[PDB]
């Protein structure tokens, strides 16, 4: 019963967060085995941040320039390297709290949990989605650089996001743990705009299934539509197209509710064209698109 | 960007255990050498409708309780019942015990919930104690015993232990002293909650949030009395404002330079005139599950 924006328990990641400092620049890092991962922007001074020459800047550094702090303890850096936009610091002590983990690059529309950290201290946890324009609508303040996003599958932590910067519109940009940015952004202190965003249609449908499971059904109708006819209306409203794979992945929700996917699409089409008429769905006046079909199945089963 | 942000759950994850009595199983909270859980665990299927807890507990011994941290058994060496919580003394002090206290939260306040099943944490989310002393949580069967909490630097304030779901789908529970929030009892019967109302103090915090972010079209040059506003609020199914609410709005009042009673008069006009097709923070609805501290917490 109920439906909330639910994040994974963050304990396994909290045990990995540390503080990285270089000169006066400081941000958060991720301590896994005997390696600390953090954004390379940490090696910039104010004069460097606007237009960094990262390769030269890293050559001009030594292990003794990096200050790594796990709580009130200092970790000794014995080696450093750069992988795209992520700095890799080898330390002489392996993190005893390292969980089973892997690095994954998520696709637009997928969700993950974000552990917001400041000066190496976890501050809050929330659930986000990778937007179609490769930004995330996070909640970050100054000092959040290096916070990570993740999913947990059984006992394995999948790290998928490392936070880097805020954009002028208030959305956020970052990389995977290989250091490759999501979207067309660069780790420079310049004003960078994102492309026009779209709505994650498959997630809206899963959320509508969530609404039905919780007894909210006013938006249902007795009509169905074709995948193509629905996609034509979706694109007109800046909604992402629905693929047959999406229809398949919604199968468990359709089977649970007895409402065919294309039946639910006809309800979404009417919502797009007529709006909610002052109504709400799961307490929302807007169509939520940051719940994947798996999140719904997970939270309602 | 404004998100419903929960506290990091690690400090609480290290305290979640499973408690089983016969085949009845739920979650417990392991702090120092004591485990706290709902007393409903001593019920068999046929006792859940109308249990005699005194009688059911008299026929229990330490060796009838199975406490497990993961697959590791913690032997129960003593037990006690306080209100609707059971306190089980175990032979192991939890080495992961954080700094903690027990607190009873007030209506309208928020907290993080660590949803657990069979002693295994499953998810974390933020929610508010509604004015009718229910919470609009997200719980499935087996979530009994999950806890709600707030963290103050290094101190964990435990404020909620989940017990049951009501016919309307909302949830009811106790503080960690075992005292229910609201007029509910731990029986498997249909219990209706009082009529819910909107958390006025949180709507006000949200309006201050909008002003901080540059959304100010709804301000007016009028003020009102606290009493006059509270009388009008009840007419619109809004909760009356308490002196604590006026107090906690102070920092937002000072940050924007807009007096509390001044912002109340702006809200009063919104209630009477509506938004006229306008939006506040990109929303057509007024959010009431963000407290003044949540705003201070997320907006510097
Ligand atoms: C308001 N907000 C929302 N998200 C963020 C994240 N963020 C951040 O936390 N820090 C940044 N710059 C730094 C300044 C520093 C000053 N000192 C002493 N140490 C500092 C360390 C950092 Cl990282 N930035 C800006 C930024 C960070 C990058 F990694 C990047 F590639 C480009 C950028 F413009 C930032 O966005 N703040
Ligand atoms: C769908 N949903 C939403 N929230 C809840 C919470 N919840 C729960 O998890 N369990 C409950 N009853 C039990 C049944 C058991 C069967 N076995 C084998 N072991 C069991 C243990 C419990 Cl606790 N209930 C019902 C319930 C639990 C109480 F603590 C109470 F005082 C009255 C009640 F009606 C429940 O609501 N399920
Ligand atoms: Cl640029
Ligand atoms: Cl007054
Ligand atoms: Mg239909
Ligand atoms: Mg006014």
Numbering used by the authors:
A (entry chain B): 1 to 301
B (entry chain A): 2 to 301
What does the paper say about this structure?
We also determined the structures of Mpro E166V/L50F bound to ensitrelvir at 1.65 Å, Mpro E166V/T21I/L50F in complex with bofutrelvir at 2.09 Å, and wild-type Mpro in complex with bofutrelvir in two new crystal forms at 1.68 and 1.91 Å resolution. The structures of Mpro QM, E166V/T21I/L50F, and E166V/L50F all show a symmetric homo-dimeric assembly very similar to that of the wild-type enzyme. The electron density map shows that the substituted Val166 in the active site takes the rare gauche+ side chain rotamer (χ1 angle = +60°). This is likely because the more common trans (χ1 angle = 180°) and gauche– (χ1 angle = –60°) conformations would position one of the two Cγ atoms ~2.6 Å from the His172 side chain and cause a severe steric clash. The E166V mutation abolishes a direct polar contact between Glu166 and the edge of the triazole ring. However, in contrast to the case with nirmatrelvir, the substituted valine residue does not cause a steric clash with ensitrelvir; the Val166 side chain is positioned 3.7 Å from the triazole ring of ensitrelvir for a favorable van der Waals contact, which may explain why E166V confers less drug resistance than E166A specifically against ensitrelvir. The S144A mutation in the QM also causes a loss of direct polar interaction with the triazole moiety of ensitrelvir (3.5 Å between Ser Oγ and a nitrogen atom from triazole in our Mpro E166V/L50F-ensitrelvir structure), although it does not significantly affect the positioning of the inhibitor. Ser1 from the dimer partner takes varying conformations, where either its side chain or the N-terminal amino group interacts with the His172 side chain. Overall, the structures suggest that the Mpro E166V and S144A mutations affect the binding of ensitrelvir via loss of direct polar contacts.
The main/3C-like protease (Mpro/3CLpro) of severe acute respiratory syndrome coronavirus 2 (SARS-CoV-2) is responsible for making 11 out of 14 cleavage events for liberating and activating the viral non-structural proteins essential for the virus replication, and accordingly, it is an important target for antiviral drugs (1–4). Clinically relevant SARS-CoV-2 Mpro inhibitors, including nirmatrelvir, the active component of the Food and Drug Administration-approved drug Paxlovid, and ensitrelvir, which has been approved in Japan for the treatment of coronavirus disease 2019, target the cysteine protease active site of Mpro to competitively block its catalytic activity. Multiple studies have identified an Mpro mutation (E166V) that confers strong resistance to clinically relevant inhibitors, including nirmatrelvir, but the underlying mechanism is not fully understood. Glu166 is also hydrogen-bonded with the N-terminal Ser1 of the dimer partner to stabilize the Mpro homodimer and intramolecularly with His172 to stabilize its active site.
